[PDB]
Design an enzyme around this catalytic site. Structure first.
Site, PDB file in Angstrom:
ATOM      1  N   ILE A 142      43.910  46.993   6.932  1.00 49.69           N
ATOM      2  CA  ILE A 142      42.915  47.720   6.149  1.00 49.69           C
ATOM      3  C   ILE A 142      42.931  47.382   4.661  1.00 49.69           C
ATOM      4  O   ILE A 142      41.901  47.459   3.992  1.00 49.69           O
ATOM      5  CB  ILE A 142      43.097  49.244   6.302  1.00 49.69           C
ATOM      6  CG1 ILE A 142      44.541  49.647   5.996  1.00 49.69           C
ATOM      7  CG2 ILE A 142      42.711  49.685   7.703  1.00 49.69           C
ATOM      8  CD1 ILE A 142      44.820  51.123   6.187  1.00 49.69           C
ATOM      9  N   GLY A 143      44.095  47.007   4.141  1.00 54.82           N
ATOM     10  CA  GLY A 143      44.225  46.767   2.717  1.00 54.82           C
ATOM     11  C   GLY A 143      44.900  45.462   2.352  1.00 54.82           C
ATOM     12  O   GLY A 143      45.454  44.767   3.206  1.00 54.82           O
ATOM     13  N   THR A 144      44.852  45.133   1.065  1.00 56.80           N
ATOM     14  CA  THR A 144      45.467  43.916   0.553  1.00 56.80           C
ATOM     15  C   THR A 144      46.924  44.156   0.172  1.00 56.80           C
ATOM     16  O   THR A 144      47.337  45.292  -0.062  1.00 56.80           O
ATOM     17  CB  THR A 144      44.706  43.373  -0.671  1.00 56.80           C
ATOM     18  OG1 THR A 144      45.350  42.185  -1.149  1.00 56.80           O
ATOM     19  CG2 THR A 144      44.676  44.410  -1.785  1.00 56.80           C
ATOM     20  N   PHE A 192      49.046  41.256  -2.377  1.00 59.54           N
ATOM     21  CA  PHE A 192      50.052  40.317  -1.893  1.00 59.54           C
ATOM     22  C   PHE A 192      50.562  40.717  -0.513  1.00 59.54           C
ATOM     23  O   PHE A 192      50.411  39.972   0.455  1.00 59.54           O
ATOM     24  CB  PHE A 192      51.219  40.228  -2.879  1.00 59.54           C
ATOM     25  N   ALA A 193      51.165  41.900  -0.432  1.00 58.10           N
ATOM     26  CA  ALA A 193      51.694  42.414   0.828  1.00 58.10           C
ATOM     27  C   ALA A 193      50.566  42.783   1.787  1.00 58.10           C
ATOM     28  O   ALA A 193      49.415  42.925   1.378  1.00 58.10           O
ATOM     29  CB  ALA A 193      52.592  43.617   0.573  1.00 58.10           C
ATOM     30  N   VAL A 219      48.830  45.387   4.521  1.00 52.97           N
ATOM     31  CA  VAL A 219      48.780  46.806   4.863  1.00 52.97           C
ATOM     32  C   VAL A 219      48.036  47.039   6.175  1.00 52.97           C
ATOM     33  O   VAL A 219      46.903  46.591   6.348  1.00 52.97           O
ATOM     34  CB  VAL A 219      48.105  47.629   3.751  1.00 52.97           C
ATOM     35  CG1 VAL A 219      48.076  49.107   4.126  1.00 52.97           C
ATOM     36  CG2 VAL A 219      48.827  47.425   2.427  1.00 52.97           C
ATOM     37  N   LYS A 279      52.792  49.452   4.799  1.00 47.18           N
ATOM     38  CA  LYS A 279      52.798  48.220   4.017  1.00 47.18           C
ATOM     39  C   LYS A 279      53.896  47.288   4.515  1.00 47.18           C
ATOM     40  O   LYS A 279      55.054  47.687   4.654  1.00 47.18           O
ATOM     41  CB  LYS A 279      52.979  48.508   2.522  1.00 47.18           C
ATOM     42  CG  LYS A 279      53.079  47.254   1.659  1.00 47.18           C
ATOM     43  CD  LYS A 279      52.561  47.490   0.244  1.00 47.18           C
ATOM     44  CE  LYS A 279      53.335  48.582  -0.478  1.00 47.18           C
ATOM     45  NZ  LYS A 279      52.838  48.790  -1.872  1.00 47.18           N
ATOM     46  N   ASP A 305      50.470  50.755 -14.866  1.00 46.20           N
ATOM     47  CA  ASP A 305      49.459  49.972 -14.162  1.00 46.20           C
ATOM     48  C   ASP A 305      48.332  50.876 -13.668  1.00 46.20           C
ATOM     49  O   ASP A 305      47.848  50.735 -12.544  1.00 46.20           O
ATOM     50  CB  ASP A 305      50.089  49.209 -12.993  1.00 46.20           C
ATOM     51  CG  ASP A 305      49.197  48.095 -12.467  1.00 46.20           C
ATOM     52  OD1 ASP A 305      48.342  47.598 -13.232  1.00 46.20           O
ATOM     53  OD2 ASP A 305      49.355  47.713 -11.288  1.00 46.20           O
TER      54      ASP A 305
HETATM   55  C1  TAK Z   1      50.029  51.953  -0.843  1.00 46.19           C
HETATM   56  C2  TAK Z   1      49.124  52.652  -0.054  1.00 46.19           C
HETATM   57  C3  TAK Z   1      48.027  51.989   0.480  1.00 46.19           C
HETATM   58  C4  TAK Z   1      47.051  52.747   1.316  1.00 46.19           C
HETATM   59  C5  TAK Z   1      47.299  53.971   1.952  1.00 46.19           C
HETATM   60  N1  TAK Z   1      46.187  54.387   2.616  1.00 46.19           N
HETATM   61  N2  TAK Z   1      45.263  53.380   2.355  1.00 46.19           N
HETATM   62  C6  TAK Z   1      44.009  53.350   2.804  1.00 46.19           C
HETATM   63  C7  TAK Z   1      43.218  52.260   2.449  1.00 46.19           C
HETATM   64  C8  TAK Z   1      41.807  52.209   2.912  1.00 46.19           C
HETATM   65  C9  TAK Z   1      41.350  53.134   3.843  1.00 46.19           C
HETATM   66  C10 TAK Z   1      40.025  53.104   4.258  1.00 46.19           C
HETATM   67  C11 TAK Z   1      39.157  52.153   3.735  1.00 46.19           C
HETATM   68  O1  TAK Z   1      37.850  52.130   4.138  1.00 46.19           O
HETATM   69  C12 TAK Z   1      36.858  52.508   3.187  1.00 46.19           C
HETATM   70  C13 TAK Z   1      35.570  52.921   3.888  1.00 46.19           C
HETATM   71  N3  TAK Z   1      34.630  53.417   2.873  1.00 46.19           N
HETATM   72  C14 TAK Z   1      35.196  54.609   2.226  1.00 46.19           C
HETATM   73  C15 TAK Z   1      34.278  55.052   1.094  1.00 46.19           C
HETATM   74  C16 TAK Z   1      32.884  55.354   1.629  1.00 46.19           C
HETATM   75  C17 TAK Z   1      32.351  54.169   2.427  1.00 46.19           C
HETATM   76  C18 TAK Z   1      33.347  53.757   3.506  1.00 46.19           C
HETATM   77  C19 TAK Z   1      39.607  51.239   2.790  1.00 46.19           C
HETATM   78  C20 TAK Z   1      40.933  51.270   2.376  1.00 46.19           C
HETATM   79  C21 TAK Z   1      43.739  51.250   1.639  1.00 46.19           C
HETATM   80  N4  TAK Z   1      45.009  51.331   1.217  1.00 46.19           N
HETATM   81  C22 TAK Z   1      45.733  52.408   1.601  1.00 46.19           C
HETATM   82  C23 TAK Z   1      47.858  50.640   0.200  1.00 46.19           C
HETATM   83  C24 TAK Z   1      48.795  49.987  -0.595  1.00 46.19           C
HETATM   84  N5  TAK Z   1      49.847  50.650  -1.092  1.00 46.19           N
END
Ligand code: TAK
Length: 315
Positions: free
Chosen positions: A21-23, A24-25, A27, A42, A131
Site C-alpha cells: 500500500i505504501g512506499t 525506501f522500505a 509497506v 513496514k 521532518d
Molecule cells: C509508517 C506507517 C505507514 C502507514 C500506516 N498505515 N498506512 C496507510 C497507508 C495508506 C492507506 C490507504 C491508502 O489509500 C488511499 C485511498 N484514498 C484515501 C483518500 C480518499 C481517496 C482514497 C493509501 C495509503 C500508507 N501508509 C501507512 C507507512 C509508513 N510508515
C-alpha cells in the site's frame, strides 16, 4: 536482494499478509490473526539506512499518543526487520490537500490542532521530529491525523536532513525544538493556500528565499491567519512563537475556546480491565514490560478493538 521466503515464517504465525500500500522500505497491509484488527507492516531489507530505522523504533517505543501512528510489534530476522504499525486508511495529508486544492480556515484549524497536539507531545518527551511534512501525516479510519516516519527524529538536549522546503533557516545555516515550529508554520501555509510559501526551481534560490523569510500572502487569508503565520515563520528561532503560546493561541482558540489537548490519552501505566480479563496479576505484569512482541501487539490491538466498540474477544 536475498529474496528469502523463510523470513516470513515467524511473521505469518501472527499476521495475514495482503497487498502493498505504501512506499525506501516496503509497506504491506496485514491482519492480526488473534484480534482480527487490520495493521500496516513496514518491511526493511537488511541487504538492500539501518541506523535511520533504528532511530524510529527507539522513538516509537517511548512515544505513545492518539495522534502518533502506534508501533505494535517489532520482528527482526536474519535479513529483514518487520514493524507492525497502526493502519491509516485515509492516506496522506499531502494527497488530501491536492484533492481539495486548499482547505478553508475552519477545516485547517481542525486538522492543525491535531498536528500541534502530536508535536507538543513529541517535544514534551524531549524529542524533535525534524521532518514535519504533509507526507508524514496520515488520516485514520476516523479521519484523524497520525504522525509517521520518526527516522530523522532526535533529542535536541541529548547526545550528538529532511525536505528543504520545510527546513528552518537555522538548519540551512548549519546550526532543535523551534525547528519543528517553523515546519508546522510551513504546514499551516500549505493547508490554507495549497502551495508552499518558499518554493523555486533552483536549490540556492529556494534556500535563500527561506532565510529571507519573505512570502506571498494570498487575499483569501484572514488577518488572524496572517498573524499566526508570522509568529511561526520567524527566521529568528528565539523570536519564533513557543509551543506553550501556540497551544492557547487566539487563532487556535477560535471556534473551540479551549487550548489544544496535547496530553497523551494512550498510557503506559494504566491497563484496561476487559482487555486483561482473558486466558490477572501475572497477566498484567507481562503487558507492563512492553517488549513490543506479539503480546504488546495483541493487547494494544485488543484495546483498539475495544475503543472501536467491537467485542473484546480473540478469534
Ligand atoms: C509508517 C506507517 C505507514 C502507514 C500506516 N498505515 N498506512 C496507510 C497507508 C495508506 C492507506 C490507504 C491508502 O489509500 C488511499 C485511498 N484514498 C484515501 C483518500 C480518499 C481517496 C482514497 C493509501 C495509503 C500508507 N501508509 C501507512 C507507512 C509508513 N510508515
Amino acid at each position: 536482494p536475498l529474496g528469502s521466503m523463510k523470513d516470513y515464517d515467524e511473521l505469518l504465525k501472527y499476521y495475514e499478509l495482503h497487498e502493498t500500500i505504501g512506499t525506501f522500505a516496503k509497506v504491506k497491509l496485514a491482519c492480526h490473526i488473534l484480534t482480527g484488527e487490520m495493521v500496516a507492516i513496514k518491511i526493511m531489507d537488511k541487504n538492500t539506512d539501518l541506523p535511520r530505522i533504528k532511530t524510529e523504533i527507539e522513538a516509537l517505543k517511548n512515544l505513545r499518543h492518539q495522534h502518533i501512528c502506534q508501533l505494535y510489534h517489532v520482528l527482526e530476522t536474519a535479513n529483514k526487520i518487520f514493524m507492525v504499525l497502526e493502519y491509516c486508511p485515509g492516506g496522506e495529508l499531502f494527497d488530501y490537500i491536492i484533492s481539495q486544492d486548499r482547505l478553508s480556515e475552519e477545516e485547517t484549524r481542525v486538522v492543525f490542532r491535531q498536528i500541534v497536539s502530536a508535536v507538543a507531545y513529541v517535544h514534551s518527551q524531549g524529542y524533535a521530529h525534524r521532518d514535519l511534512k504533509p507526507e508524514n501525516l496520515l488520516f485514520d479510519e476516523y479521519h484523524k491525523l497520525k504522525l509517521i516516519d520518526f527516522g530523522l527524529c532526535a533529542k535536541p538536549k541529548g547526545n550528538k536532513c529532511g525536505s528543504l522546503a520545510y527546513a528552518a533557516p537555522e538548519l540551512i545555516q548549519g546550526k532543535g525544538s523551534e525547528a519543528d515550529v517553523w515546519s508546522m508554520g510551513i504546514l499551516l501555509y500549505v493547508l490554507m493556500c495549497g502551495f508552499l510559501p518558499f518554493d523555486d526551481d533552483n536549490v540556492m534560490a529556494l534556500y535563500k528565499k527561506i532565510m529571507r523569510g519573505k512570502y506571498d500572502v494570498p487575499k483569501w487569508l484572514s488577518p488572524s491567519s496572517i498573524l499566526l503565520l508570522q509568529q511561526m515563520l520567524q527566521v529568528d528561532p528565539k523570536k519564533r512563537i513557543s509551543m506553550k503560546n501556540l497551544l492557547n493561541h487566539p487563532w487556535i482558540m477560535q471556534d473551540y475556546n479551549y487550548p489544544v489537548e496535547w496530553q497523551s490519552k494512550n498510557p503506559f501505566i494504566h491497563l484496561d480491565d476487559d482487555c486483561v480479563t482473558e486466558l490477572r496479576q501475572t497477566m498484567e505484569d507481562l503487558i507492563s514490560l512492553w517488549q513490543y512482541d506479539h503480546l504488546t501487539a495483541t493487547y494494544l490491538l485488543l484495546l483498539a478493538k475495544k475503543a472501536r466498540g467491537k467485542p473484546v474477544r480473540l478469534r
